[PDB]
Amino acid sequence: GWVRPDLGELSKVTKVKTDRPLPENPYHSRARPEPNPEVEGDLKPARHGSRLFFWTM
């Protein structure tokens, strides 16, 4: 009394109840590098113009 499965029955995804713990580091990866800091604060106006050897504006 074993039933031959229909088309599409074996092609579906099932669930498993497993007693093993989840590995936190499957790739054996070290710590990622620290990201560079972002920009903060209000966009202040230009200090004394463009300063291109004589320009004040």
Partner 1 sequence: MLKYIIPTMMLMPLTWLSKNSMIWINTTLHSLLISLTSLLLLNQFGDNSLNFSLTFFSDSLSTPLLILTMWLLPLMLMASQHHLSKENLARKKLFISMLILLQLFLIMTFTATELIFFYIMFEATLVPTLIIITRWGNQTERLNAGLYFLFYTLAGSLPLLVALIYIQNTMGSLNFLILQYWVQPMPNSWSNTFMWLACMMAFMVKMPLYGLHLWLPKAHVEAPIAGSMVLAAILLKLGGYGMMRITLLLNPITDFMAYPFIMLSLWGMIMTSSICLRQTDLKSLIAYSSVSHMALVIVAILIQTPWSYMGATALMIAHGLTSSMLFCLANSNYERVHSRTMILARGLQTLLPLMAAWWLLASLTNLALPPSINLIGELFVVMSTFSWSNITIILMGLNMVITALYSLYMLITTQRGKHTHHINNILPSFTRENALMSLHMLPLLLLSLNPKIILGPLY
User: Of 39 and 57, which has the nearer Cβ to partner 1?
Assistant: 57
Is position 2 an interface residue for partner 1 (rule: CB under 8 A)?
no
Is position 56 an interface residue for partner 1 (rule: CB under 8 A)?
yes
**First-to-final CA distance of the chain:** 92
Q: Per-residue x/- mask for partner 1, residues 34 to 53, rule CB under 8 A?
A: -------------------x
Q: How many residues bind partner 1 (CB under 8 A)?
A: 3
Residue 43 one-letter amino acid: L
Tell me phi and psi for residue 54, to 5 degrees. Answer: -150, 5
